[PDB]
Each structure stands twice: as C-alpha cells, then as structure tokens.
Design a protein around this ligand. Structure first.
Ligand SMILES: NC(=O)c1ccc[n+]([C@@H]2O[C@H](COP(=O)([O-])OP(=O)(O)OC[C@H]3O[C@@H](n4cnc5c(N)ncnc54)[C@H](O)[C@@H]3O)[C@@H](O)[C@H]2O)c1
Ligand SMILES: NC(=O)c1ccc[n+]([C@@H]2O[C@H](COP(=O)([O-])OP(=O)(O)OC[C@H]3O[C@@H](n4cnc5c(N)ncnc54)[C@H](O)[C@@H]3O)[C@@H](O)[C@H]2O)c1
Ligand SMILES: NC(=O)c1ccc[n+]([C@@H]2O[C@H](COP(=O)([O-])OP(=O)(O)OC[C@H]3O[C@@H](n4cnc5c(N)ncnc54)[C@H](O)[C@@H]3O)[C@@H](O)[C@H]2O)c1
Ligand SMILES: NC(=O)c1ccc[n+]([C@@H]2O[C@H](COP(=O)([O-])OP(=O)(O)OC[C@H]3O[C@@H](n4cnc5c(N)ncnc54)[C@H](O)[C@@H]3O)[C@@H](O)[C@H]2O)c1
Lengths: 237, 244, 235, 240
C-alpha cells in the first residue's frame, strides 16, 4: 500500500467526523501506523483502537511545548521513527474584525500556527536523523480568498500564517529531504456558497484526507512548499 | 488499483523516456487501459503493447483537428468511453525573445495550446455523455516564473496559455463533473552538461532534478478519485524551485 | 508630471471609450508624448490630435510584423526613443469551449499574444540601447479565475499566455532595466454582486494602474501581475 | 498632489532610514498630513516636525490595545479623520526553525500581525463613519517564497498572516469603501547579500523609497479599484 511500513502522527484526529480522523483511517488502510494526538487522552486512545491494531493515541495541547515533547517522545520510544506529520489540529471562530479580542486571537493562532510550529519542531530532529520525512499543514481557502466562509479574519490570518511557516520550513529543510506542504480545503462537511462551487457539492473529510495521503506518500516525492487547493473550484486562481 | 476499469488517453506518450510514457506505464500498472496518441503509428502501437494487453496506440497530430477526431472516434468505438485525458504532448525551443520567428511561435503554440484545446474539444462530448471525467493539462514552471530554465518566452507563453485554458474549461464543465487541472513540472530529467546546471540545481531545495515518474505520479493523483474534489488546480511539481 | 519627458507607445488606443484612449489621455496629462497605434490611420491620427500637441497616430495590425516595424521606425525617427510600451490591443469573443474554431482561436490569440510579442520585439532593441524602459501588458482576470465573465476559453488562454510571455521577458531583460509587468483588469465598463467595492471598473482605473507601472513610482517592479478587479478575485 | 487634503497614519515611521519614514516623507510631499506612531514620543515628534508643518508624532506600542486607542483618539481629535493607514511597524529575527522560542514567536507576531489587527481595529470605525479609507499592510517576499532572505520562519509566518488578515478585512469592508491591500517588499537596503543579489533580475537591492512609492499608489486614488491586492516590490526576485 501507499504508506506501507510508515509511521504517521496526526494531530486533532480524535473527533469522529473530523478531517483528522478521516485521514487516520485512510492512512491506516494504506498500511501506516497512526499516532493520534488530541486534547483528551481517552478519546484519542479510543480513536486509535478503532483504526485497528498497532496504533497509538496520545494527549497533548499542540500549543504546549511540554505536552508535545512528552507525546513525541512516547511515540518515538514505541515506533522509533515518525515518517509523516499531519498538523491538522485547528479551531475556528465566526467573529468579525472589530469583535476579535486578545483571547480570541491567541486561542485561534495558538492551535493552528503556534501548534504547527511546536509540533514540527518536535518531530523534525528525528526526521532529519532518519533521512527525511513529510509534513502536511492544514490551511484554508479562507487564507487565500480573505475569509467569507465561516472563520473570522483572525482565522484567515492564522491559516495564512501556516502557509508562510510551511513554505519557510520547506526551504530550510529541503536538503534534509523533509518535504513540507500545505492543504487549503474549501467548504468541508465536518446554499449560497454551494452555488459558487463549480463541482456542485461541498467537500468531504475524505477528500482532504486523500489529498493528505498524496502529500504524505511517495507519489509526491518531488513536491515541497506546495499549497494544494481542495475546494471544488470555489477558488480558481 | 487507483484507475481500475478506467480508460485514459495520453498524448505524446510514445517517447522512451518521456513523461507521457512514464504516465502511461504508471496508469496501466494502476489498472487503466491506455490509449497512446503520438505522431508515429508504429511507435505508438509498440509503446501500447509494451504496457501490456488491452491498450491501444493511435497516430495523430494534436494540432490537426480531423486527425484528432478520427483517433478519438476509433478509441471510443473500441472502449466506449474515455474517463481520463492527459494533454501531455508538447515541444520546447531554447530561443530568446528577439529570435522568435512566426514559425517558431506557431510550432510551439500549436502542440501545447492548440493541441490541448483540440484534444479536449474531441473528448469532452463523450465525457459529458458518460457523466464526467478528468482532464490533466501539462504546463510548466516556466509559465509561472518567466522561463529561465530552457524553453524560450514563446514556450513560457504557450504553457501559461494552457493554464488559462484549463481553468476556463474547469469552470465551464464543473456542472458536468469534468474536472480539469494542470501540472507545472520544474526541471525534469528527460532527453545537464552545461555549467548552468549548478545554478539551477542550487535553487532546488530538494537538491535534485525531477524524474518523469514524479510528474506521472502527480498526473495519477489528478486522474484518480483521490482528487475528486479538485478542479481548476495548478499542481506544482518542481522540488521547491518555485515556492509561492 | 509623472511621465515628464517620456515617450509612450500605446496600441489599440484609437477607440474613444477604450482603456487605451483613457491611458493615452492620462499619460499625456502626466507629461508624456503618446504614439497611438491602431488599425485605422485616420482614427489613430485624430485620437492623437485630440490628446494635444506633439503626439502621433499610426496604423498597424499588431499581429503583422511588417506593419509594426514600419510604425515603430516612424516613431523612433520622430521621437528618437520609446520609454514606455503599453500592449493594450486585444479582442474578445463570448464563444464557449466546443464552439471555438481555428479562425476564432487565431484571431483572438493573434491580437493579444502574438501582438504583444511582435510589438515588444520591435521596441525592445531601442529600449536596450536607451538604458531601459517599461512594458505594460494587458491581461485579464479571466486568465486567472478561468473566464466566466464574458470572453471564452480562448480569450482566457490568450490573456494567460500574455502573463507567461510578460514574465519571461521580465526575466530576460531585467539586466537591461527593461521592466515588464502585466495588468489583470476585472469587469471594466449578478457579476456586480460578487465585487466587494460594489461597482464596475472604469477605463481610468486601468489607465491609472498603467501609469503607476509606466512611471518611476514602480522602478523596482518587474514580472508583477497587478490586479485591477475591485476585489472580484482575491487570492 | 496625489494625497491633497488626506490624513495618513503611519506606524513605525520614526527610524531615519526606514520604509516608514520614507513613506511619511513622500506622503507629505504629496500633500498629506502624516501622523507618525512609534515607540518613542520624542523620536516620533521630531520625525513629524522634519516632514514640515501640520504633522503629528505619537507614541504607542501597536501590540498594546489601550495605547493604540489613546493615540488614535488623539489623532482623530486633532484632524477629525484618518483617510489612510499604513501598517508599517514590524520587526525581524534571523533565527532558524528549531531555535524559535515562545518569546521570539510572540515578539515577531505581536508587532506585525497583532499590531496590524489592533491598529486597523482602532481606525476602521472612523473610516466607516467618514465614507471609506485605504489601509496598506506591510508583508514580505519571505511570506511568499518561504524565507531564505533574513527573517526566520516565524517572520515568514507573521508576514503571511498579515496577508490573510488584509484579504479578510478587504472582503469584510469593501461595502464601506475601505480598501485593504498589502505590500510584499523584497530585499530592501555580505556573501548572503551577494548571492541574493544574483537572483534579482533588476540587479540591485530595493530602496526604502521604492516601497514608499508603492504605498503611495495604494494609498492614493490611483488605486481606487484595488482591494485585497498583494503588490510585490522585489525587483523580480520572485516572479510567480
Ligand atoms: N471546513 C473545514 O472543515 C475546514 C476548512 C479549511 C480548513 N480546515 C482545517 O482542517 C483541520 C480539521 O478541521 P475540522 O473540520 O476537522 O475540525 P474538527 O473540530 O472536527 O477537529 C479538530 C480536532 O482538533 C482538536 N484540537 C483542538 N484544539 C487542539 C489542541 N490545542 N491540541 C490538540 N488537538 C486540538 C479537536 O479536539 C478536534 O478533535 C483544522 O485545522 C481546520 O481548521 C477545515
Ligand atoms: N523538463 C521537462 O521534461 C518538462 C518541464 C515542463 C513541462 N514539460 C511538458 O511535459 C510534457 C512532456 O515532456 P517531455 O520532456 O516528456 O517531452 P518528450 O519530448 O519526451 O515527449 C513529447 C512527445 O510528444 C510527441 N509529440 C510532439 N508533437 C506532437 C504532436 N503535434 N502531436 C502528437 N504528439 C506529439 C513527441 O513525439 C513525443 O513523443 C510536454 O508537454 C513538455 O512540455 C516537460
Ligand atoms: N472589461 C474589459 O474591458 C477588459 C478586461 C480585461 C482586459 N481587457 C483588455 O484591455 C484591453 C483594452 O480593452 P477594451 O475594453 O478597451 O477594448 P476596446 O475594444 O475598446 O479597444 C481595443 C482597441 O484595440 C484595437 N485593435 C484590435 N485589434 C487590433 C490589432 N490587430 N492591431 C491594432 N489595434 C487593434 C481596436 O481597434 C480598439 O481600438 C484589451 O487588451 C482587452 O482585452 C479589457
Ligand atoms: N528588507 C526590508 O526592509 C523589508 C522587507 C520586507 C518587509 N519589510 C517590512 O517593512 C516595514 C519597515 O521595515 P524597515 O526595514 O523599515 O524597519 P525599521 O526597523 O527601520 O523600522 C521599523 C520601525 O518600527 C518601529 N517599531 C518596532 N516595534 C514597534 C511597536 N511595537 N510599536 C510601534 N512601532 C514599533 C521601530 O521603532 C522602527 O522605527 C516592517 O514591517 C518590515 O518588516 C521590510
């Protein structure tokens, strides 16, 4: 299978209907061993067991350096390597520009942007030592088109910041064969907007998961710094 | 078998070490029946038989409307449908702006741009009747960064026109479930002895040239159901040569 | 006087309501001498005369190498230099993918893409000898978002090809200080509802963007695609 | 006089040779009254007095909501309007991915991203009441190409976040005629510099005046139909 013998760590994959869980399932179907990292230990463990045999569920706030370090250490002690990192953890808030408070900014930016940085920092050393890896970051069409879907401007900023971080890490670690790419999903299921989608439907969690599979697998071995749109034509540019 | 039961037509796939042939091989390995369309009938037939059994090789100049329509008819009569179209046919020319003659412009634009339009026009009616399809167009990083690799400005222009055409067809036929996406390969190892290679390679973060199989795997993604929600996309395959 | 002492050649600027004429008018107001190149000699001469004094109107099909060479030579003979080239000439057709014929493809591609190449080829030698210049190419939002406004897919392809050509010429001639940039105008006078600024574009809006790219205010810009679409496409 | 009768607030314009000061000078030459907002009151007042007559210098940390509110209150009390906002304040740090600490992330993100949000939040209400305005945000080519110039990944991330924020505000306030656009400057004025210079088609580094002239375009009526735009000022360093 596409991820035969690979180990993948996916943040925010404990929710049954989320993109993270759909990615964990498709990754497990493709032969990978999956480490689910989310906020609730019991939920993460149960999600890992549902995948099958040989998976792991850990608890960590991706914005907490200490908790991330403990989770990555436990994963490396058991699997010895992390080939793939899916920075899927993220939150949104439908609050407009003038209503964004300091705590709203901090919460939204911490999960997506700071969390992608902290998790990447924790996994990159092992990837560099093991000869490379693949990091997938979750952005949003809102980062490209300027919101207008659900998340507020601080969400658009956070997901745009993820793109800048991912591109910068792609350039820094290209020589180490650590590929860093980003997904920009459109409106995913996890009327007026539907009319603006050429393919005439909303996205599925499995659609984003399949894009993550492509970027995590050797089918994309020559891709780094790429922003892969998964929006059904909602944004053609 | 990502392409099980699918039928794929690939233009310019008769060359031994080209992207088209690499795409045909990977597509066949994934369960697809492949129709190779190139300039030489014997070369196209031999390439198809090299893939395995049940494939087809046809001869047509993608810039010749009547030749394309004849080849597409022959493919539809045998297979009954075309699920995937890979507009891979293309030529390049390393001449600079002031040296581009009318015949140079015509030759380069005809294979890439007019050919992509003519082949897409010939296949789209059957795709609409069959409920959808996937069209992959071959562009180039030169269309995005303004050349500087090998092909001259008319090559950059032709491959940029392909992107405009692809996105326009993506929008027009989205309701018909005909996905149209483009590949923008970087410097790919095909048929590196000049000092200018060091500078180009130094600008590739992954530190190597691309391989035909790299572009073929991206075409496989766009041709398969793994990209069912992607249309109008431009997918860079350049090793980080252009991050934007 | 952002274009004081400058000489600018603008193709397709003979129509009274077009972007080309609006650009010529604003360029003349900013101190430039303008050479209008269009299909009809009398219409081009009258348009140039309407700008004021010291301007010139010439006739040439931008897709005709011989006619372009004659026009540029006449312009250089009189002005001695061409500081700015505005490749504004272009045509559109609202025909869909399956209805595009060979003649439709050729006509639309010839004016925008081949015309931009032929005119640029004819002016670049003098710009190299004169220490640089500014070339502005007219693309379209349709080249970026995939049509859906008016022009058909061959128009989107032609205007996308212009962007690729402009970027390639920008890279080749950067060392000659020949800046090459492109404009991607939106809907210029249902679509209105998808425009955040709540109005259609004006010919003067595109002309003002061309003025910026033609002037020294953009001395460090080359290979740029400048959107003038009122927010119709944010990306 | 492209900015005749306009009032422009420029953050981080107190440094002598910075982009902000160059923008203030060009804006003043074009008829605008400029409000310089920087960290030090004395430096800001002196910079404003150097522009000419009728200008104002204020002290505020763009990442401090109450200081920004006080400075904008004082500017609006004197001028009665703010037509233009240039979110130029920003800092950079040349540290690599694995060396970015929490304090580094906070410092860089606070000035560029949080500061742009806080200052825009403070000025937008008056722009809505005055019938429109123009907001120019300062990003960087590093946000587009993934660093490799000087600022580390957290700088690339902060300036990329500025682009996302600017586009989102452009879409939200288009109906209020508040245009929001971004500048992405390249390398603006030894081995690293020489190598970068070799990848610049125009063959030179940018000048503060080059970016100021682009800000003038976006602030003036010459760009009245532009919103949500990212305007590259990089001499061809990044063509895309
Ligand atoms: N429409 C969409 O669904 C859409 C569109 C664009 C981008 N995205 C991004 O895709 C990703 C998945 O989206 P979703 O719809 O699946 O979300 P979701 O809410 O279903 O799941 C996200 C998961 O992240 C976990 N999480 C939240 N904060 C965390 C933290 N600090 N540390 C660890 N885990 C944490 C939550 O517990 C949850 O399980 C997110 O990054 C989201 O922003 C989603
Ligand atoms: N470095 C690269 O290889 C690179 C980079 C960017 C884009 N591309 C594009 O990828 C595609 C494949 O590249 P390549 O390196 O494999 O090319 P290639 O030269 O090996 O093969 C191209 C094939 O197209 C065929 N062909 C030419 N004109 C034709 C016509 N009029 N009708 C039908 N067939 C025709 C040729 O016979 C040949 O078999 C082309 O579109 C090329 O421009 C390649
Ligand atoms: N909505 C828009 O108007 C819009 C949007 C995007 C791009 N554009 C482009 O902006 C430019 C101006 O658009 P417009 O609305 O002003 O068009 P327009 O029809 O008013 O003017 C075009 C001019 O080009 C001239 N012309 C046509 N073919 C020519 C040729 N072969 N040689 C010389 N001159 C020729 C015509 O005579 C006319 O005067 C064109 O390139 C157009 O595609 C326009
Ligand atoms: N190469 C470049 O110079 C370059 C490239 C891309 C983007 N930019 C951006 O352009 C802008 C100007 O760059 P520069 O080269 O002029 O910088 P600069 O250091 O000269 O000026 C920045 C100014 O911001 C002020 N400042 C810092 N933190 C502040 C705060 N919290 N509140 C208020 N003022 C504060 C400083 O006092 C200084 O006067 C910055 O946003 C920078 O990131 C610069």
């Amino acid at each position: 299978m596409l991820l035969q013998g690979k180990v993948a760590l996916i943040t925010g994959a404990a929710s049954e209907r989320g993109i993270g869980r759909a990615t964990a399932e498709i990754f497990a179907q493709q032969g990978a061993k999956v480490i689910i990292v989310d906020l609730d230990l019991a939920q993460s463990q149960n999600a890992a067991k549902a995948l099958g045999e040989g998976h792991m569920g850990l608890a960590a706030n991706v914005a907490n350096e200490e908790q991330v370090k403990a989770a990555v250490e436990q994963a490396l002690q058991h699997y010895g390597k992390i080939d793939i990192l899916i920075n899927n953890a993220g939150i949104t808030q439908p609050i407009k520009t003038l209503d964004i408070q300091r705590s709203d900014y901090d919460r939204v930016l911490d999960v997506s942007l700071r969390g992608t940085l902290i998790m990447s920092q924790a996994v990159i050393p092992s990837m560099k030592a093991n000869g490379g890896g693949s990091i997938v970051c979750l952005s949003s069409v809102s980062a490209q088109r300027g919101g207008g879907i659900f998340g507020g401007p601080h969400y658009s900023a956070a997901k745009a910041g993820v793109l800048g971080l991912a591109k910068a890490m792609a350039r820094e670690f290209g020589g180490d064969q650590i590929r860093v790419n980003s997904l920009t999903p459109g409106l995913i299921q996890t009327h007026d907007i539907l009319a603006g989608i050429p393919l005439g439907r909303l996205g599925k969690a499995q659609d984003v998961a399949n894009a993550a599979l492509f970027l995590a697998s050797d089918l994309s071995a020559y891709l780094t710094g790429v922003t892969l749109d998964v929006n059904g034509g909602m944004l053609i540019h």
